[PDB]
Each structure stands twice: as C-alpha cells, then as structure tokens.
Write a protein that binds this DNA or RNA. Sequence first.
RNA 1: AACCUGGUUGAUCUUGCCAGUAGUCAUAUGCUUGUCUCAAAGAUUAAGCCAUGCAAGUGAAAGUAUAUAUAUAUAUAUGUAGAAACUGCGAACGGCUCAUUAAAACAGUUAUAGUCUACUUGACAUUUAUAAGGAUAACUACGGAAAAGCUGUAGCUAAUACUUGCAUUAUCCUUUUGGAUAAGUAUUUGUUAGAAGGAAUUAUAACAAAGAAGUAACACGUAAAGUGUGUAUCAAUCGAGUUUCUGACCUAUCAGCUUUUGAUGUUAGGGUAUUGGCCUAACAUGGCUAUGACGGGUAACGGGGAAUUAGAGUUCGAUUCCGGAGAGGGAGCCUGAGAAAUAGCUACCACAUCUAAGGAAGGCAGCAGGCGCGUAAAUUACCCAAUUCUAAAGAAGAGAGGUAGUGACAAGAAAUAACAAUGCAAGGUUUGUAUUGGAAUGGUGGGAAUUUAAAACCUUCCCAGAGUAACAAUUGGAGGGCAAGUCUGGUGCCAGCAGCCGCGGUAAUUCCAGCUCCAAUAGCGUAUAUUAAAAUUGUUGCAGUUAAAACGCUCGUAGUUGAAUUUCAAAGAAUCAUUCUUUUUAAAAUCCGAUUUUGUUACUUUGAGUAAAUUAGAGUGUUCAAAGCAAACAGUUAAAGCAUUGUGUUUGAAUACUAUAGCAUGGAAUAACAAAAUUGAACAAGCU
RNA 2: CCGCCCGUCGCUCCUACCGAUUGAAAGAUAUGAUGAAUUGUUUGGACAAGAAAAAUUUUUUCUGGAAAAACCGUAAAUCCUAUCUUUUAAAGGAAGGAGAAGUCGUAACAAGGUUUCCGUAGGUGAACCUGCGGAAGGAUCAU
RNA 3: AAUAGAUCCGUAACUUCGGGAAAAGGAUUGGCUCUGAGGACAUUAAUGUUAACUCAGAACUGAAACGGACAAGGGGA
Lengths: 125, 171, 257
Amino acid sequence: PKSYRNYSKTARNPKRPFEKERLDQELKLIGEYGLKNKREIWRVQYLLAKIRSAARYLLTLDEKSSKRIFQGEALLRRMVRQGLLGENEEKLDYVLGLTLPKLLERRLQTKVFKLGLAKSVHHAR
Amino acid sequence: RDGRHKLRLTGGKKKIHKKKRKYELGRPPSNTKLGSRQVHVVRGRGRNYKYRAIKLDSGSFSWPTFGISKNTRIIDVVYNASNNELVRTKTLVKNCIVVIDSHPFTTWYENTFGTTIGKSKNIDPLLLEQFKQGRVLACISSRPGQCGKADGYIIEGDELLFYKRKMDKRN
Amino acid sequence: GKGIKKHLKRVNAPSHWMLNKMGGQYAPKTSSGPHKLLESIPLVILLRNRLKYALTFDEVKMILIQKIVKVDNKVRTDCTFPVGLMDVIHITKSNEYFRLLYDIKGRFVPHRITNEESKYKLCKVKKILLRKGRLSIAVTHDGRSIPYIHPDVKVNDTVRLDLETGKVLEHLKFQVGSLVMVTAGHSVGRVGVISSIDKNMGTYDIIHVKDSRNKVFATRLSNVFVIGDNTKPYISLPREKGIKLDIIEERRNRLKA
RNA sequence: AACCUGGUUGAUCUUGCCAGUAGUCAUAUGCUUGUCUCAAAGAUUAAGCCAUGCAAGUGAAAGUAUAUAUAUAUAUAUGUAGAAACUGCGAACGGCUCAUUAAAACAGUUAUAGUCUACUUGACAUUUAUAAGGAUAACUACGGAAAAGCUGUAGCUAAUACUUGCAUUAUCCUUUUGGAUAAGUAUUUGUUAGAAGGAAUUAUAACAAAGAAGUAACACGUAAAGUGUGUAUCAAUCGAGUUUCUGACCUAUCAGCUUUUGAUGUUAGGGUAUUGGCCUAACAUGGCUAUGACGGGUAACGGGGAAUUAGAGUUCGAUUCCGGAGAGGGAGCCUGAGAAAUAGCUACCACAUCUAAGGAAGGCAGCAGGCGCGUAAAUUACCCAAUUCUAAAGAAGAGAGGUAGUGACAAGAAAUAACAAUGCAAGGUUUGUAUUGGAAUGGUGGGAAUUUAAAACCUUCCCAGAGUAACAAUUGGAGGGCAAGUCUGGUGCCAGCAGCCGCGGUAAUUCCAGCUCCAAUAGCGUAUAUUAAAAUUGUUGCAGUUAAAACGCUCGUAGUUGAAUUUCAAAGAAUCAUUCUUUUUAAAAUCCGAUUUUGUUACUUUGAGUAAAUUAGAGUGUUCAAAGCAAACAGUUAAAGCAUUGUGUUUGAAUACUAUAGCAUGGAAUAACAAAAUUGAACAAGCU
RNA sequence: CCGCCCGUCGCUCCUACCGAUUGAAAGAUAUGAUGAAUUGUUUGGACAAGAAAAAUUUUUUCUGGAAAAACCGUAAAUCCUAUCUUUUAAAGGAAGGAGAAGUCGUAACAAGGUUUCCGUAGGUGAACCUGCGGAAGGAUCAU
RNA sequence: AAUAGAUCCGUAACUUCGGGAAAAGGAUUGGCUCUGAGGACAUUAAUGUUAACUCAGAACUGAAACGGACAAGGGGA
C-alpha cells in the first residue's frame, strides 16, 4: 500500500520570529553569501545542529570507549572530507566549535566565486 | 462449544467476540446401548476417523491375573460410578460394570491348565463361585464412543469386593 | 477460513535475504522441505540475488526448467526450494560447485568448492529415534533420516555424509576441542573451538566458544554445528574463515587499500 | 537553543490565570501558485445503502478424446494438436475495514511429557495376473418453464472417478554351508520388561485379544536404468489450536461480587485432534476483592511505532508490517488437510431486484464507480512487463500487484536574472544608484534519442524561442507583545478593527482606502485538536500563616518508612611527585607441605534469545538533497591478475536498540528474609 | 467620600434545575412464552439393485436407501414483563449570569457612624436585625 | 366473570425501617415404573433385624391434561 521510502525535513523554523539581532545576522549571512532565502540558512544550521549534537553526545562518552573510538573518527573523517576542519585539528572540540559561515563556505557558489569564474556571488548563483 | 461463554475465575462476565470456531466442535454424545453390533463413522479433524458405537453385544475381556484376553458377549450392565440412569437404560461407558459370559474363560482354563508362561496362579473363591454360576462381573476399559468397541477386564480381589458391596448393610 | 498463509511480504522476509524495500511488495515464500524458512534461502534468490545469473523470477524458472542445478547431487526444479544451512549446489552447464555457508555477518553465501569436496556434506544429527526391531535412525538438521547410524553417534554430534550413496563416512563429537560454527545468534557465522559447556537443568544449555584470536563468545547449544576437530575444519570456509572482527578495526582494513 | 513577553496598580513587588510564541507523518478551509523529484488520499460521520463492469482459476512428456483438424511409408502404424465434459488441485491465500473487544485481544516469555497438520523433503510396507467389474458425464433424440450458473426421460462409452483382486522375508542350531521355526501398519484393551529426557505410564520389546487403511490391475521417457501420479507409518517442513509468567486508559455519585441457570474444587464418564466444568451425574463449599473484585465509560482493535522532547514526561497510533476480529445483524451447516468460509449453502430479522403474479434471485468494510452523510477524501483508466501466488506449474490467470490519471496531505531540490559605461550620493580615484546593450539561460512549442507491457514523466540532443525579461509572487501585517508609518484622504462611539491590552465622539500611528515599509515566501493565513512553553499536575520538580489549600482533635488497620552491631589490613611492579596492577590473612570437606567449595532474594554486571519497516548509526557524490542500497576499478579500444589458450576483478548491504517481566551469569556494598534458649547442638566411645 | 458599594423589587435575553403528566422515544440486558433452520439418534419405507423358479411373470430375503415424523441438542427470530442507559416535552415553581441612566433603602470599606467576621437559632421588604458561644483578619501587642 | 391450593422463581414507589408483600409478575402440578436422602435395635473397626411419611431427581405414558370435582385473593396508578 503505502510507499516504503522515507522522507525528512531539512529545516527548522526559528521560533521567536521577530528577534531584531537574529534578523540582522540572518540578513548579513544571506547577503554576503548571496543565497536566495533564509530557509537555506535554516537548513545549514539544522545540519550544523545535527553534527553538534552528535559531537557533544560523543564527548559525553569516556575516552577509549568503543562507541566513541568508532563514531568519533567516523564523524571526524566526514568533517575532514567536507573540509570543515583543518589538519591542525585532531579532536572533537573543534567540530563542536565550527560555525555557520564555516559551513556556508563549502557551497558551490561561494567556491566558484572564490576561485574566480564569476565576478559576484549572485553571478555565481 | 468449548472454552468461552463461562464466567471468569473471579465470577465476572466476559464479553464475547470471536464467534464460534469449527475446531471447538463438540459432537453430541453416543449413548451406546447393548444390542446388535452397529457403529457409525465420525470424520474428526484431519480426516481421522472415530468409530461411534451405538450398540454392542460382545467384546474383548481380559483375565488380568493371567493376562489373557478372550472375546465374549456382554450379558448385562449392573453398575456405573456416574449417573445411575446409565445402568438403568443400559448404556456402555468406559468405567461401566457389566456381567459377561464366563464360559470362554472357564473352557480356556480347562484346556491349558487342565482340571476345572507364569502359570499356577491359584485363582480365588469369590471369582470361582461366579464362574460356577456362569456369568462374571467385568469392568469396561475402552471408550465405545471413541474406539467403537466395548472391551474390558474381569474384576477380582479388593475392587471386586468393593463393587459387590456397592451393588448388594445393603439392599 | 484461516488456513496456512502462502504469501511473504518483502519487509517481513528474513533480513539475511537482503531483499530491497522497493523491489516489489512480496518475497518468495520458500516451499516446505529440508530446512526451515528462517534458516534457509530459496534458490530463486540464491541464483538471482547472489549469483546474479537470473534477473527475474521468470529467468529463474528458465534456469530451473532444464535439469541443470542439483541440490545435494540431485535435480531440483521448484523455484522456492529451501537450499539450507550447508550443502552442495552443482550447476552442470557452468560446471561449478557451491557450498552454502554463513559469512561472519550472518548471511548465506555460496562458497566455491572443488569437485572432490562437493561429495562430502556435513549433517548435524538432531534426534536419535529407535523404531521397530531396535533399529536406530538419526534425524539431522537437513531434515534427513539416516537409518543404521553407528551407536556411538550422539544427539549433538555431526556426521559426514556421502551424497552419491547417502551413507555416513565418519562422525564428529562435541568435546571441548571440537571446532564449531555458530548458526543463528548474535555470533552467527563465527568458527571457534568450544571453550566449555554449561548444562542447565531444564533450560537452554549454554556453550562458550573460543575464537582463533582467543576471544570468547557464548551461545545456545541448539545454535552450533560441529565442523571438525582441533586439527582442522572438515569443510572449506569462506575467506573470512569464520573470524569476526571488531567494527572499529574493520574500518582500518577497509580504508587501507 | 535547557528562552520567554503583553494584561489586575496612581505607582510597586507577588500569586494567579488569560493572551501571545513555535512544532505537529494533524485534519479542514481561504487566498495564491512558474519547474522537477517524491506520494498520503471516503478512517473520523453512516461496520450506512448500492446501479454497472471486473476481482480465482488451472492442461507445452506424463488421468480420461472416433466432437474435430492435420502430417509422414503405404485401408494400415505412428503422430501432432484439440472445443466440451468427467477427474485432480486451488478457491481457507490474497485484498478490505476497525464494528465488537478492558486481563479479553496483543506483546515479550514459556509448554504442548495435552494435540492436529494438505503441498514439499528424507526414510521406506503388513493378515484372469501377457492385468478384473458396473456406471456416468460429455454427446444424440424428445421436452417443460415469463425468467435463473433450472433442468426430466431414453441410449451408449472412458478414466490416476467408483470398486474387487495375483509371492516372500526374518529367526535356531551342527559351525561359506543343510535342515529346523515364525509371520497385521497405525489405533484400542489387559499383563509385563524397559537409547533419550529434567522428569516417562518414553522409544522399544514380550505375551493375550481386536484392527482401520495400505504395500501400483495407473501414465510419459534419461544414461554415448529415469520421471510423473498415488499409497501405510515415522521424521522434517509450511502452520495451527490450546497454554505459563508478566505488562493497559478514565471512573467508588460502582463495595462487595460469583454460586438454582457451573460459580471453585474432587471423583467417574461423555465429548474433542488433544488438556480442561468443555459438558453430564454424584459430592464438597468453595473462588475473587480497597494491591479496586464486580460494574459503568471509552468519540478503545493491540503492538512494531508517531508528534513533541535538555533530562523526566505529555499526547497519539483507523492507516505499509505482525497478531485479532468481521463480511447488513444473528444462528446453523456441507465439502475439505485446513472454514463455523460468506464474490459456499440453510433459516430468521432488516433492506432490496426480476416476474406473465405461478415463482426466481442478493450481499462492494475487494477494484473502480454512485447515493447518502458530512468540515472532511481520486479514474466506472492501462497491464500482468516487474514482485509474488494458484494450476494439470515456461507459454494461463491474478482490480493481488504494478503503471499512468486526479492530487498545494505531507517531504526534497529549485526560477522570477547576472554583467559593462557615464549622471548622482558617499570615500581619498573606492561602494551603492537611473540610462543605455550586448551575452547567458531556463519556462514554452516541435522533432528525435531514450524510457515504457504500450504510453506518459525524467534525462539528453536539434530548431525556434526574454526588455516593461507583461514569461509582471503572493499571503498577512505596520500602537505594544512583535519586524515594520505621530505619511495622505474618508468616517466620526457609526461603520468597523482588535487572539490580550486596547483603537474609533474631527489630527484615528489601530477602522475604510492610496503610498511606503515589514515578515515569510511558491507559499502564506484561519479554525479545531495536541506538544513545548507549564517548575500552571511538580518522581526529577510546585504550593498550603496572610494569595487556593493542614482534617476540630486523638486513637487506629491496610499502606509507606524504620537505631547501631557479625572480616579488618600489610606487602610487591608500572604513567606522574602521585596514581594504577598483583599475593595472603580464621574454620569445615578436596588433593602426600601443597593442590579448592563454603545461605535466599532484591539490586547491580555481563551474556543468551532478540522480525523487518521506523530510530540511532557505518559505507556509498541519487548532478546536491529528500533518497536508495547500491556500487567501485584498467580498458580510441589491450596490459596485468589466474588456467592448464580463455576466464573480468574488488566489494557493501554493518553495528546499536528491541520491555519493567522471563533464561543464564560475576558480585565484597546497601536493603530485607531465614536460621538464633522457660534451652539447641557438634564430636568421641559403647548399643540397636 | 460629590469615593466605593450591597441586596430585594420591576423589564429583556441566555443557561441550568425541580416538576404532576401510572410523560415520551431509542437502545441494552435478564426472565418467561412461542419458535424458522439444523447436528445427532430413532422411527421410516418412493425404489435400486441382488440371491430362487417356471421357458413373459411370481414369492421371500439381503443390504443401500429419498420424502416424512419424533426426541435430546445447537438455536435465529418475535412477543410479554422487568430493570438499566441516553435523549427529550411540560402548566407551574425556583435559581444563576448578562444588559439598560429603572424603583426602595444604606448593609460593608473610616470607630462606615450599632467594630467586623464565624457557627447556630429565630425574625424582618431588602440589604439585614437579634440571642448564645467564639476569633482579631480590631479600633487594644501596654500598671 | 376473571386466578384463587401448593412448590419454585421474582417482587417497585414509598416507609414510622417494623412494612408495603400473596406487591406486580412468571413456571410447574396427573398416572405409572424407578433412583436418592432423612432413624431405631448386637456381636467380637467390621456383619444382620426392623418403622414412619416427607422431600428431591429421572424415564415412560395420555386427544397437552392433571390444586381435573370440592375448595379457593382480581390486580395496579
């Protein structure tokens, strides 16, 4: 009967819809990464919250515990492949500390603008 | 016809869904009288046949102190531990007490032992007197409503004394 | 009515069949036969999903119509035939011999075997029944009845069976040195040496089994299969050799390539 | 993301609620809507009523063919097929719905040493024979009835339909070998003996009685002897019926229920596939209950799960899977391995169809579709190509299922531009900003490749095809909460707005409009319900002098809670200065100076057994993502690997969770219980 | 304090309650009565086939057997009665809430002009008054 | 006129808690053949002799009738 393939939301509404400083920060990010909607930044911070929750749960676990010494390097290698952490990074505190612009730097439009090709981020989009 | 519609252990009434199933069944009883041998066939679960006897005259009967079974005929039914209506209407059931012909047993004793395996059992007088009469008391051991044949063993010793006292400080 | 069900939903199918969610609504319900549905695979999925010889159930039927594939050196044509825990599958057109076995991850794999080895199947006796005449029959995991077994054979032993003649060749006991393969637990697929046997009165008997790298795992007595003595397994094993690895260090050998 | 804000006042600090805020795989509805992917969908109310059509059939070696057609050497032998019909199997699966149901169903955990079990699989049998009997369909002829999946009579023929019925083996002894002896599968009865289980009235064996059903009077052809069909018993398997323990929402303005009418138990029987008050007869007076019985309510099918979660929790679960139940409501029954079956039958009730009026026929909570009900839900479409089931099993069917149609239920990605030069503003020749003016690209139309059962969609290619890129984005607001106007007209306590506080009586920042601005954005409002907010249900974690709230007081049972006390330390290696690892030290049984067990439970630690889907999570560039469970690698055209000339190779589909109850398991602490004196032992010797 | 504020009585609207009417309706149980269909058993007995004889026909017997009938049982359905549940009509009665500048008084808040309040009892147009015993939340923390 | 005896079942409002009450309202009843229960008395745990009608249950039976005549409440609001 019902289809067996799943689907999930990728964004979460902020709640407290009219914080002035939150709106200003969102507009700054939107304008300086040239993205069409704040739904997109909501997706980015939803993903960021996912990674952060995984990281803090792992940090709660004691060192050399099996769950930590499996999932920690799983997550760490995923972040390294994504380019979110550098070589000087080795621990989970840094993946806890990575931020929204650091996540946004990896979008295609930002990368192509940085490499050239398009002279504006909106041109890249 | 089995399982439900009763009261709970606490005395409460249980609501009834799940209308009656076939595997609960509950066939009507067979009031097996004694008469010309006639049995019917009941097709139980799995096409297994059950022989429902309605009338029997004869059957296998065992002298257990010798462990020898001979076919004889049932003359009467005289006692049954359950409802007293069963003996009055002369129905054969599993634990019924019957009177059977003892001539095959006496003839077998004469033929093998002589006179009137683990032989030389010395018999007993209470059963000897019954043999001399010619009719002997026996207890059914099969289920005529299930196997389709009445069959049992001669009672002797303390159980014979018990049943004789119960049938006839007495009336 | 409420007779026997004759359909299997895909998600209700056994997990080790590895059938995909979206690949239809039903799974092939294995026909009744030598092995339980849970501890066997139908040869339709054996040579459609594992060997990839057939792409559809109709192609499985196409293979089966010609009396090519033989299960225990005899021709099988039922599409949903339970192949079972361990036995030989001979495909004559391609001239290949398989033994059905368990990987360390608890899944059924056809392991390549030689023609010489394809005549030596192993059967785990499950019951010893004496019938009329004091004649003894061993009932094995294969659902097979072997009359006139050697009186030394016990209820948890195993016997090497010749497929051509259907006769026992030798038997294997269950001492603390007999190597076994676990069949249905968390440790399905592991091969060990049996460290100890604990026999609880009236409940499941547990056995602790020592691995090659000296790691011990416990299991229920009914879920083991004696394979050999301490010297060597009497059958060949898949490439993992029944050696399970910790997941944290399977990753390292996956990465090094 | 472990959050708060407006409102009682002249002002203040509280309690306290109202209101705001966000989510909802949560429903409806309003406005709006250019793409693609993904896909819920007559559950809520009416398990209400249904026109029509379809939804279970089946013959490729293998039961029965002079209906009939055909082809080879020549009326001969082979055949190939084959309508109908008999026979066999299936139709007890699937699909739908959630009415009933409150220890019932279900779930985890057992038992069946208390049972049944078709197909399939392995074993393997006992008390005229160169091949036995009638009797029937199809068919033929005569018919009846308005009508039906109605059928009478007469005549023949088959069968794997129905029914009869035809070696031999084993054992004792002199001792390869000679004579001798015996002959029932299940099932039932009586008397006995007795490879396993945890425990046997077990397997099995002997004796004495019965005794089914069978052991082929059947059909086609594989190695350069086979198969099909059928058959007794055992075993396996697909299952099923009962069954152990434990687990459920609200209600005491339900406190005593059950027991003639079986309630609880014993005995004997009947019945069943089997156990059982399941039923019967006799007997006894039991059984449950404030740890909530018995009742009532549920807008209650249960669970896997879902929403919301910092942690606890609260709410939901008709609905993919599993289990249960039902086919308008009841009841009864046939066949069958399996049904108390409903696209099977019988009857009653309620509906309801045809009728020539005599009689027939029905069950959409199957797929579409219609009426009704409603706030509330799609096509009387295509196909068996995939998944899988049934068959006489390749070849036929399947409204199962798949495909498309409707579809702003939800979910994911993502257009409505981007860029160069002056004028203007800001700044030491840097940013923003109306003009031009060329690129770029979808949306769209057409052809094609492709896809597909066919078609459509996606993708890809080729033609056209954007300047007011008219290829024109909306929804709701602008006093505070809460982002955004003391801007301009109209109205003037009216109209109206306003979730709350409030605005409106001529200057209305709040109504009706325009402009501008704000918010979210192909989406945005509204209503209802629910979660967080709510530490305003508080176990974590509330409050009770005065805000609501200590019984008037004491006794007191259930419940909850309960002082201390019984085996303590020393010594030795390794990180950094400490931390960490190891041995013994009373008594009783074990091993000839040493070899090894020493209450029960809770609790706690480890395991075992854990269906998937969902969840967490490992891997994997579906162009990303939602996803899925795949995939990856050399190859303008062949090296290498291995095989003794060819064969692609490497893989992955993990792990975790799966109660609180049950099984096993290490345990020193903390808790109980046990044992412990108006006395109770142990040892030695003698005695029975 | 020209503050605030209480109650009766008038008028309107809304909600709920009591209510004679042996009120009404729909359900659900239980007993009783009748009782379709049907398992089983028995009684049956249309005939359909056998065994005997005469050289087209007859008797007897064996099974097998359809209508039909009876009796236990399973038991639909209908009716009576009783009880319970839900909904509901109603003369009249008596509340609560809301509304409007209505009428009468001044109960409380100041020692509110008789301090207030509690329990109880009686009385009065209404707020209320009075008796008895209490409390300070009193207008007294005090020879 | 309607039952009306007896046994079994069931019994409301109201109430001064005693009643109402035989409330209301149901079922059964003959004959025959049986079954079961209820006592007293003596011998060295056990065996015999003997008596009332009183209940309960079951078959069978009949023109479905049985407190067969007699006798004998009508109830309810």
